[PDB]
Every structure is written in structure tokens, then in C-alpha cells.
Amino acid sequence: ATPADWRSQSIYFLLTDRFARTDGSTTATCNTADQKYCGGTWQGIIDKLDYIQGMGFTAIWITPVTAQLPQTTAYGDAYHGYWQQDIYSLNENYGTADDLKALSSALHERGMYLMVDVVANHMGYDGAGSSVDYSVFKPFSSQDYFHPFCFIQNYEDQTQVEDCWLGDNTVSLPDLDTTKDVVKNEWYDWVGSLVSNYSIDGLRIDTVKHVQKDFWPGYNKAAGVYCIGEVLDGDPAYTCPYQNVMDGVLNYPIYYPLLNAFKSTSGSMDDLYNMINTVKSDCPDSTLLGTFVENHDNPRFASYTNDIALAKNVAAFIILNDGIPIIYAGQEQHYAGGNDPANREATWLSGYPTDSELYKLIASANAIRNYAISKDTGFVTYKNWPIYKDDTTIAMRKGTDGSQIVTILSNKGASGDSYTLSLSGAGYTAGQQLTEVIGCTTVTVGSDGNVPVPMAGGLPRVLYPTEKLAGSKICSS
Numbered sequence: 001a002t003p004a005d006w007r008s009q010s011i012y013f014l015l016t017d018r019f020a021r022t023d024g025s026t027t028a029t030c031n032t033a034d035q036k037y038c039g040g041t042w043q044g045i046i047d048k049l050d051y052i053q054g055m056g057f058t059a060i061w062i063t064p065v066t067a068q069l070p071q072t073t074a075y076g077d078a079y080h081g082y083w084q085q086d087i088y089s090l091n092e093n094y095g096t097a098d099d100l101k102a103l104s105s106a107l108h109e110r111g112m113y114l115m116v117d118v119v120a121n122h123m124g125y126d127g128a129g130s131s132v133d134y135s136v137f138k139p140f141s142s143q144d145y146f147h148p149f150c151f152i153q154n155y156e157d158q159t160q161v162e163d164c165w166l167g168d169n170t171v172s173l174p175d176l177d178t179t180k181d182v183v184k185n186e187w188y189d190w191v192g193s194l195v196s197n198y199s200i201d202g203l204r205i206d207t208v209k210h211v212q213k214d215f216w217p218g219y220n221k222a223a224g225v226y227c228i229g230e231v232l233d234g235d236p237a238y239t240c241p242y243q244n245v246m247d248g249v250l251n252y253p254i255y256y257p258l259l260n261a262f263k264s265t266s267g268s269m270d271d272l273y274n275m276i277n278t279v280k281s282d283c284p285d286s287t288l289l290g291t292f293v294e295n296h297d298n299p300r301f302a303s304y305t306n307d308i309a310l311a312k313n314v315a316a317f318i319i320l321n322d323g324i325p326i327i328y329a330g331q332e333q334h335y336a337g338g339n340d341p342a343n344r345e346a347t348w349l350s351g352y353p354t355d356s357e358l359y360k361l362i363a364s365a366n367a368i369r370n371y372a373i374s375k376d377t378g379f380v381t382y383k384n385w386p387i388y389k390d391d392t393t394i395a396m397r398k399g400t401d402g403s404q405i406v407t408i409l410s411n412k413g414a415s416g417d418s419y420t421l422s423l424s425g426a427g428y429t430a431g432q433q434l435t436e437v438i439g440c441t442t443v444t445v446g447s448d449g450n451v452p453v454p455m456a457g458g459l460p461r462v463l464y465p466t467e468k469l470a471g472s473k474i475c476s477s
């Protein structure tokens with residue numbers, strides 16, 4: 001698929017080893033602290049697609065598929081897939097090439113896209129950087145294809161961040177010399193060949209900031225699909241520019257104030273407010289970025305607060321903000337693991353309850369989003385923008401006039417009081433009836449143009465014109 005095709009997508013991010021086993025067990029042991037392969041496979045994913053698609057997701061992003069280092073390191077196995085050694089072979093732990101082909105097929109059949117996580121920055125190796133036997137890596141079987149050995153000590157030195165190695169002497173990550181044309185051509189031919197042999201619709205590019213920019217354009221072109229990269233920095237000035245060399249990047253600029261705004265009933269609505277506008281103007285295209293508040297490199301949201309209402313609100317923001325929504329497997333089951341490895345819990349251990357509170361919130365949010373796009377070709381391109389905010393609230397508006405979705409979020413929490421917010425600025429016609437598609441209730445725009453929104457239980461409210469819902473099966477009553 002193309003970037004344009006992706007704008008309208010909703011991503012469910014999962015770790016192949018931790019989503020679903022071929023047998024389907026929901027009790028098979030997976031101690032995150034052991035950092036060992038727990039059994040997740042590609043076939044396991046196919047068997048649980050109903051579960052995923054049932055939340056309104058239109059795509060999935062799975063971790064890297066290349067063959068990893070074999071050893072169980074002092075830090076566990078390469079179950080996460082970021083320690084590759086043979087790029088022309090697949091991690092047999094997940095299955096065969098036929099399984100991977102069958103996975104994308106099952107998806108394309110459901111009208112869903114398949115996004116694959118790929119690493120061009122490094123290989124993995126069990127041991128000190130001085131003991132690396134380069135012949136092990138394929139095709140890059142020589143030390144020349146790599147940068148001289150050194151560990152990145154000063155992350156403020158970009159050249160270092162790009163020329164030195166990640167990891168340490170326990171588990172080092174041999175750093176490829178992405179300036180040598182032999183490397184680039186190999187990587188460009190590989191990625192193109194990869195997307196082709198597995199019918200991949202888009203790519204999530206790992207450690208994008210550790211590889212020099214002039215490498216990414218050709219990679220993105222060779223991929224022949226949409227590429228969203230991981231530039232691990234919350235500074236929009238440093239992160240957004242990468243979209244000039246790659247179709248999109250993960251929205252880490254929004255991530256931090258987003259998390260802080262809803263992780264407690266005293267979060268800063270201001271910071272989120274302003275980051276939204278800053279990104280909207282400074283970033284090449286906010287509608288091509290990826291929104292999230294939870295992933296495998298940060299404590300899960302629930303680790304900060306177990307408040308279900310706050311969880312609903314942050315999840316609602318992720319789905320309604322500009323760009324592509326990205327939910328990390330387990331988030332919908334209120335998982336609360338902390339920093340890696342604690343945040344790589346197996347999804348199956350939850351029992352895949354399709355009636356959990358966040359599973360429903362997400363379904364409802366994705367439903368209205370998916371519907372709106374189906375009737376408004378300008379939605380995905382309409383820059384979300386905040387129309388209101390107070391110490392515990394923020395409201396935004398997105399979508400062509402007459403068909404806009406107006407989202408009201410609150411960090412008051414589950415014990416939030418009940419009151420009426422007179423929302424101004426929504427832009428709906430006076431007297432028009434609206435449907436709050438999360439709780440499925442209506443509200444009528446006042447004569448003055450303001451919308452009396454009933455606030456309670458610190459719940460998120462999402463408005464859309466009731467008349468526009470004619471036909472759909474959103475809030476059938």
C-alpha cells in the first residue's frame with residue numbers, strides 16, 4: 001500500500017512471540033523476566049484475527065521476521081527479533097515462509113494490511129564487541145561492511161549515534177556501515193525483495209535515528225510501500241524532519257505530554273494542547289505520523305495508573321488524533337507491565353476477552369473513525385485541532401464541516417463528578433442532534449451554537465451528527 005492508503009488505517013502492534021501460539025493456549029507459561037521464546041507464531045496470529053479485527057483495526061504491525069542469533073544470551077533469547085544475523089532466512093520460531101505468506105493472505109482477505117518491522121541499522125551478537133565473528137552474519141559476512149567498534153556514549157553527538165554500536169559487551173549489536181554503496185544496494189534489493197515475497201503493505205523501520213538520513217530515501221523507494229520510522233526522541237524539531245526522508249515517523253513528540261496528561265488526575269492538559277499545534281504546523285505531515293501511548297520500550301499506561309476511565313480517554317485520543325492510531329497488544333486488556341522486559345507480556349494469558357472495557361472503548365472509537373472516513377474523503381487529511389481545554393479537559397475537532405468528530409477528553413478519572421460542559425467552538429449547526437458514539441446517547445446543539453455535553457465518571461465523549469449515522473450500525477437503538 002501507499003502512504004495515502006495508510007492514512008485511513010488503524011494499527012494493532014504485536015510481538016510475534018507474545019501474541020498467539022499455534023496451539024491457542026491461554027495458560028501457556030510466559031515469564032517476561034526469563035526473556036525466552038514463549039511460543040508465539042505467525043499461524044497463531046491468523047487464528048486470532050477475528051479478535052483483532054473485532055476492535056475495528058485495519059492492520060497489524062509485527063516484530064522483525066529475519067533469522068536471529070541462536071543463543072540464549074545473558075539477556076535471554078532474540079524473541080523480540082531485533083538481533084538478526086541471516087536476513088535471507090526467517091526466524092523458525094514463528095514458522096515457515098508459507099506461514100508468513102498465509103498470514104498476509106488471511107489479512108488481505110479481511111481487507112486488512114500487514115506491516116512488518118525491519119532493522120537495517122545492526123545485526124545481533126551474543127558477546128563482547130571484540131569477539132564478534134563477522135562470518136556469522138549473512139550476507140554481510142565481513143567486518144568491512146560494519147563500522148569500527150565503539151559504544152554510543154554521548155547521544156548528543158549525532159555522528160556517534162550513527163557510527164557507533166548500540167547494546168553492550170553482554171549483547172552487542174554490530175553496526176552496519178550504511179554509507180558504503182554495497183550495503184545500501186544489498187539493503188535496497190533485500191527490502192524490495194522482502195515486501196514482494198510476502199505481500200507486505202507497509203513497513204515500521206526500527207532505530208531510524210541511528211542511520212544517516214541519505215540512506216532512508218532509497219530504502220523507502222525500494223520498499224515500494226509506506227514506511228513509518230522509529231526516531232526515539234520527544235523533540236519535534238529533531239524527530240519531525242525525518243519525515244522528509246521517510247513517509248512517516250512514530251509520534252514520540254506527542255507521546256510524552258499525552259502520557260503525562262492522562263496518567264493522573266493532575267496531568268497537564270496544556271502541554272498536550274500545545275504539542276498538538278506544534279506538530280500540526282512544524283511537521284511535514286501530521287496525518288502520516290503514528291499516535292501511541294504504549295509500546296514495548298516504555299512502561300505500559302496501566303503501570304502508571306490503573307484507572308479505567310483514564311485508560312479509555314488516552315485510548316480514545318490515540319484513535320482520534322491526526323495520523324495512524326497504534327495500539328500495542330495487551331493495552332486493550334489493561335496490561336500493566338513496566339519497563340522492558342516487563343512490558344512484553346503474552347497477550348494470550350488474558351484469555352482474549354472481547355468484552356473487556358478497553359476492548360469495547362477501542363471498538364467504538366475505531367468504528368466511528370472507520371465510518372467517518374467512509375463518508376468523508378477529507379477526514380484523514382483534515383488536521384486535528386484543539387478547540388477547548390481546562391485543567392482537566394481537552395476537546396478537539398477533526399473532519400470536514402458538517403461531518404466532523406468532536407472529541408471531549410477528561411483526566412478526572414473514574415471518580416469524576418457529574419456535570420454539564422457547555423462546549424463552544426464545535427462548529428455544529430444550532431439545534432442539530434448529535435450522537436455520543438461511545439456511550440450511545442444523544443445531545444442537541446443549543447440555539448447559541450454551544451453543545452451541552454454531559455460529563456460523568458471521567459469518561460471520554462465523542463460526538464458526530466446523528467443524521468450522518470443513518471444506515472450505519474453505530475449505536476443502533
Ligand SMILES: *[C@@H]1O[C@H](CO)[C@@H](O)[C@H](O)[C@H]1NC(C)=O
Binds near residue numbers: 087088190193194
Ligand atoms: C524471495 O524468494 C526466493 C525464492 O522463492 C528466495 O530465494 C529469496 O531469498 C526471497 N527473498 C527474500 C529477501 O526473502
Ligand SMILES: [Ca+2]
Binds near residue numbers: 161
Ligand atoms: Ca548505525
